Structure formats: C-alpha cells, structure tokens
C-alpha cells in the first residue's frame, strides 16, 4: 500500500553494495522514486535492460532517466501497475524481475557509452523482483 | 421543445460559470485475468460507436482474444439520466491484426476506419508495415432480413496519400460535414523529406534544449525513419462507386508529434484535439480554422496537461527529445466563454487519480474525482451531448483498482450543473 524510499542515483549511494548493486522486492501497487540529485556533478543515462545485458553490463532503447542537468532535480516515478504514460509498453508484472543499469562513465564524455561503465565498476544496478518476499 | 438525446447543439440551458471549490458534479455510472483496452468511444445523435480488444494477460502483452465493434443507442434511462445501449455487435476473425479503429457517424450508420497488421501496432513497426486499411459500416438500427444493411465491409480502392508513404486512422472519432466524413489520422514521412527550420524550435528560457529538439521529437525517437504528422482521412461520400480516402495534414501552427486525435463538432463548428506525446505536455484542443487543409485554432491553456515520464513529465514546457504521455479529451461545451469539459490523470509521472474537470484556458471553475486517488487511470474520451436541453456529459475512462481481477473501461456520466453556489 505503500511509496517505496526513493533512490538516488548517485555514486555515493551506499545501498549499492559492491558487485551486487541494490536489489528492492517491489509488490503491485507500490510507487517509487529514482533521482538524479542537483549539484562536481554526476552525469547519467540509466536504463531498463533484461537479465543478460545487466549481467554483462550492456546497453543496445530509450532511458528511463537523462541526468545531464546539473542545474536541476531530474526525478522519475514509477507505480508497479498495468498503466503508464510509457508508450512502449512499460509493465511490471508480478513474480518477474527487472534490471535497471547504467553504461556510463560518469562524465560528461562518457554518457553513452555502451559497455562496462558504472554498472560493472561501482555496481550501479537495481534489481527489482516483482511481488516477491 | 425537444426531448431525448441529441447533439450539443443551438443554445442550451447555462452552465455554472465560476470557479467553486466545493463538490457539484455528480458523476454517475453507467453499465478473470483478462484485460480489457484499445477502447473507442463516439457519441454522435443518439448513437454511439464503442470498440475494445479483450486481451488474456498483460495489457500491453497480452494475447488479443475479441475485438468488438460496435454501436448503438444513448437515452434516457426514465430517471433524466442517460444510458448507453447496445443495438448492433461485430467480432471481427483476428483480433490481433485490428490496430488504431476510428469511427464517424452519418444518419444510418457509423463507419469504422482500423489499419490492418500483421507485425503488430504499426507505429511501434512502421519500416515493416505495409499500409493497409479496412472499412466497417455498422447501422445504428438494425433491421431483419435486410441484406448489408445491418453490417458491410467497403472495400478501398483508392488512398491519396500525397508526400505521405503510410497513413492510417489515429484516434477515436471524426465527423461529417454534409456527405463528406474526415477520421482523424496520421502519415509517415520519412525523415530525409521533412521540411523544418530548426530555428523555428523554441529553446529561449530553457538553457538546457537545443534547436534540434523539436525537430527530432517528430519521430518515435530521435532516429526514427519516419516522423508521424497529424492530419485527416477524408472519405467523401457523394462520390459514385470510389471509396477514395485523402490524407489532410495538420498546418504546422504548434506541430508537435503526430499522435492520437479527435475532431468534433460542437454547437455547430468542428473542434479538433491532439494528444500529447512529446515535450509540449499543455493541452491540445482549440477550434477548427479550416477543415482541407487542416488547421486548428489551438488555446492557450495553462492548466491541463498530461503525466510524462523522466524527460516531459507533467508540466514541461521545454522541447525535449520524448516520446510519452496519456490521450485524455476535451469537449467544448460553450464557445462563448470557451469551456471545455474532459477527465485529466492528476498525476506527474504516473497513470492514475482521475478527475473529471469543466475548464477555461487559464482556470478549472470545477471538478471532481472519480475515484480515490493512486486508483489507476489511462486514456479517457469524453463526449457531451444535449438531454432534454441540459449539458450531460459521457466519458470512457480506463480505470481499475489494484487487487481487481478484471481491468475494465467504465463509463461516467456527468450533468453539467446550472448554478454554482
Ligand atoms: C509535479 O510537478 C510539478 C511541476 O514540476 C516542475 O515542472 C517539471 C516539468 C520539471 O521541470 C520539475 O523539475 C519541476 O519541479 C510540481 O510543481 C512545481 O513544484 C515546484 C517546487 O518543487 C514549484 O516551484 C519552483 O518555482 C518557484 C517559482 O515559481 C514560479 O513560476 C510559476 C509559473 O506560473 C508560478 O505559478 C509560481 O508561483 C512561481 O512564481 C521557485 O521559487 C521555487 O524555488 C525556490 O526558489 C528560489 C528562488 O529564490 C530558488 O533559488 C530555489 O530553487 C528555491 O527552491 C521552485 O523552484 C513549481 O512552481 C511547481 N510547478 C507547478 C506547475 O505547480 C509538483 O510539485 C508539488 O509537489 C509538492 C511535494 C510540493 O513541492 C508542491 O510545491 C508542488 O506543487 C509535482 N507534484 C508532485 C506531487 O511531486
Ligand atoms: C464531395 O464530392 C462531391 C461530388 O463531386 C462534390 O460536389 C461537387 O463538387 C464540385 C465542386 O464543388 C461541383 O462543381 C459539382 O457540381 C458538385 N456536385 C454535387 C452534386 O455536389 C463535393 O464538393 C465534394 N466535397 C468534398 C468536401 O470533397
Ligand atoms: C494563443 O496565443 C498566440 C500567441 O500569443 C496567439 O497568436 C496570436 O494571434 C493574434 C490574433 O490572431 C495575432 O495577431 C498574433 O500575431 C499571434 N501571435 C503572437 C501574438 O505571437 C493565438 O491567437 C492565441 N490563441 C487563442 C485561442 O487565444
Ligand atoms: C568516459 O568514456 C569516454 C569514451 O567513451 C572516454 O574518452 C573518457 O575519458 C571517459 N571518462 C572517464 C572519466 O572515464
Ligand atoms: C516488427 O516486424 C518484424 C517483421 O518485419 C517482426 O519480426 C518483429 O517481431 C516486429 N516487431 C514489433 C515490435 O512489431
Ligand atoms: C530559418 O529561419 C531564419 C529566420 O527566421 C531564416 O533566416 C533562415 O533562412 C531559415 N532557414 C533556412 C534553411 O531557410
């Protein structure tokens, strides 16, 4: 019934554990927040990935989060349900998992890369498993 | 005097015209593991056009089991309140190949324009689709042993596509002007023949966008093929044997992506409404300049906008490279003051707490919930209508309640009230 405690992305995050990431355990219904705080600033395209490109720490899709504005707050709300502004079909279903990574370096000159990044280096990943636990 | 349900049309009894906190709309409700979606919604004279695909699973993945198609009759139900009854039904044999339906009603019956696909949603596919469009036309009251009356596919000849690859209906519902009906449709350009100025992009005020923007917010992402442009299909009637459809583009006065759309008439001129799929998140609606070629007369209104994700959520302003958002309608219920009546998702990133609101350009004078807040809401048409000379209006509302077994489209009806305090 409840809002999750929102995320930010940022490297100093410590619910990231090293190599693992953060895994949450979201149910139907609940919200949540992912934010890419205001400001030396962090620089970010987080996205939304099946099982093989996170393990692997790759990208090939649209971000979920653009956090490339040191000026301002850039927030993204999720709601585990059926409907979504996503005209691509975003769905949470439950007793199914879902990964959210991030291929870059964290500078400016990095935001798209495509490979390693973040994701394999700091372990800036969630692991989302769906009405679970 | 005229009694029963028919257009909002002539002068009807006044509306409440001020802004009023407390609650005076009265919406009331009209009649395991499916979902049901891609609703359609036309209320036209007395009749209505309705569509679904009922779907086992996921919403959006799920396996198309029945596409319904069908029409009817709005009354009174004896108690001055309307209700919706279903005269006239088609399944048609593969649901999953019927993609984005529109309907338009002239005296007899509604014709219904979909895109057939075999590579799924078109928009999703667009290099891999080939263009191809179907005709149903369905009486609104049908008759026994009476041939093709009851229901009767037309058959295509000829589509007039212009500079246009692909077009296809996109939206729910068009209208007539005389024997001539226009559905609300898109065309696929590709992006090699686009005409655009990038200077024209509005970026003063917002240090982080480029001139780019816009341009590349035409497309389903910035290196999309094609660009979707907004526009009608014509269908002119008089015409002898020829079922010819003509693409009309929309005029490139706030072009923003070509998305789901609406063209209606009310109190007698046609107004146009344009979801909003993109950076420009403000409502879309205004009316109707000139029909061929189409150009709409947009408002300026600073307070209806839609939920978005990361980049264009709710109340951005800036152009950004999106493509997101919900469809929720407007209806012009008095041109003198311009008020509009429609259901926005009062939500900044997601899809729920419904409210169905009778605005003006830069204020809601009154609204009210139609459910409790984190209920889930999507697309919502509305279309109001004259009972008896009072404003009524009837608004599809995608909507379920977490926990629900069955998500379903619900149907409001709302009385437009007269004094205020
Ligand atoms: C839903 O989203 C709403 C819109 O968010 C904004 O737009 C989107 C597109 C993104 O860009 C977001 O990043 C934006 O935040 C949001 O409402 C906004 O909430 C802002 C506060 O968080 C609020 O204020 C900021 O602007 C004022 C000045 O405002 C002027 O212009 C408008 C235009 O008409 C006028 O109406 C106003 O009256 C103002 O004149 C700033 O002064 C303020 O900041 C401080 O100002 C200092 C200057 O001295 C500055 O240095 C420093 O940054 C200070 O913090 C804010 O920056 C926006 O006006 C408001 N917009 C709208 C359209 O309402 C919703 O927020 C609700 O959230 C709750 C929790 C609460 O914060 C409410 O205030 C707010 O309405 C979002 N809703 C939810 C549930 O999250
Ligand atoms: C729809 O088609 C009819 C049939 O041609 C058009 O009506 C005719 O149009 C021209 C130009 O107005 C006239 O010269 C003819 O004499 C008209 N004949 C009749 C019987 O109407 C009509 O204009 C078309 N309308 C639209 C919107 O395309
Ligand atoms: C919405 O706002 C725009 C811009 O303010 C209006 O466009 C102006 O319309 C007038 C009258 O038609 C013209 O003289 C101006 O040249 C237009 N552009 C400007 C002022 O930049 C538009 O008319 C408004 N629409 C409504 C319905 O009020
Ligand atoms: C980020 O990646 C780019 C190449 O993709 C590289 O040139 C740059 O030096 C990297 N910066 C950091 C801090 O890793
Ligand atoms: C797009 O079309 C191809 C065939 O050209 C098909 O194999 C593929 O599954 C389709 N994908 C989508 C998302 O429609
Ligand atoms: C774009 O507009 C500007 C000013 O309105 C004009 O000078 C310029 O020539 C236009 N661009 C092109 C390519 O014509």
Request: aromatic share 10%.
């Amino acid at each position: 019934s409840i809002v999750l405690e929102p995320i930010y992305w940022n490297s100093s995050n410590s619910k990231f554990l090293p190599g693992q990431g953060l895994v949450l355990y979201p149910q139907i219904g609940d919200k949540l927040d992912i934010i890419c705080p205001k400001v030396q600033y962090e620089y970010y395209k987080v996205y939304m990935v099946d099982k093989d490109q996170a393990d692997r720490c790759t990208i090939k899709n649209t971000p979920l989060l653009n956090c490339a504005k040191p000026d301002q707050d850039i927030k993204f709300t999720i709601k585990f349900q059926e409907f979504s502004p996503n005209l691509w079909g975003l769905e949470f279903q439950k007793n199914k998992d879902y990964y959210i990574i991030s291929t870059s370096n964290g500078s400016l000159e990095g935001l798209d890369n495509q490979e390693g990044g973040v994701c394999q280096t700091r372990a800036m990943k969630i692991l989302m498993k769906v009405g679970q636990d | 005097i005229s009694q029963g349900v028919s257009d909002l049309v002539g002068l009807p009894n006044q509306i409440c015209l001020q802004k009023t906190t407390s609650t005076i709309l009265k919406p009331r409700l009209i009649s395991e593991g499916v979902c049901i979606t891609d609703p359609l919604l036309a209320v036209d004279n007395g009749f209505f056009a309705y569509s679904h695909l009922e779907k086992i699973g996921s919403c959006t993945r799920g396996i198309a089991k029945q596409r319904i198609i069908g029409v009817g009759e709005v009354l009174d139900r004896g108690d001055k309140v309307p209700s919706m009854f279903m005269t006239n039904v088609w399944t048609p044999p593969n649901p999953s190949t019927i993609h984005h339906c529109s309907s338009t009603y002239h005296e007899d019956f509604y014709y219904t324009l979909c895109a057939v696909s075999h590579v799924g949603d078109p928009i999703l596919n667009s290099t891999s689709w080939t263009e191809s469009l179907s005709l149903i036309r369905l009486a609104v009251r049908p008759k026994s042993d009476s041939g093709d009356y009851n229901q009767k596919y037309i058959a295509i000849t000829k589509v007039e596509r212009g500079k246009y690859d692909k077009v296809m209906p996109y939206g729910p519902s068009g209208i007539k002007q005389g024997d001539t009906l226009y559905f609300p449709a898109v065309g696929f350009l590709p992006r090699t023949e686009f005409q655009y100025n990038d200077s024209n992009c509005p970026i003063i005020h917002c240090k982080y966008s480029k001139a780019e923007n816009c341009r590349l917010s035409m497309g389903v992402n910035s290196k999309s093929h094609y660009i979707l442009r907004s526009g009608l299909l014509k269908y002119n009637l008089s015409l002898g044997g020829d079922i010819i459809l003509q693409f009309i583009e929309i005029a490139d006065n706030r072009l923003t992506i070509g998305s789901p759309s609406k063209i209606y008439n009310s109190l007698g001129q046609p107004v146009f409404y344009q979801a909003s799929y993109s950076w420009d998140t403000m409502i879309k609606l205004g009316d109707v300049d000139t029909v061929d070629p189409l150009r709409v007369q947009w408002r300026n209104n600073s307070v209806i906008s839609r939920p978005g994700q990361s980049q264009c959520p709710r109340f951005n302003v800036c152009p950004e490279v999106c493509w997101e958002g919900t469809y929720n309608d407007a209806f012009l219920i008095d041109r003198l003051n311009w008020v509009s009546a429609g259901v926005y998702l009062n939500s900044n990133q997601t899809a729920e707490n419904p409210v169905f609101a009778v605005f003006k350009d830069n204020e809601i004078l009154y609204q009210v919930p139609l459910a409790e807040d984190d209920t889930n809401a999507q697309k919502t048409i509305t279309d109001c209508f004259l009972l008896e000379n009072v404003i009524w209006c009837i608004s599809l509302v995608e909507i379920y309640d977490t926990g629900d077994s069955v998500i379903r489209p619900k149907l409001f009806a709302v009385k437009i009230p007269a004094q205020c305090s």
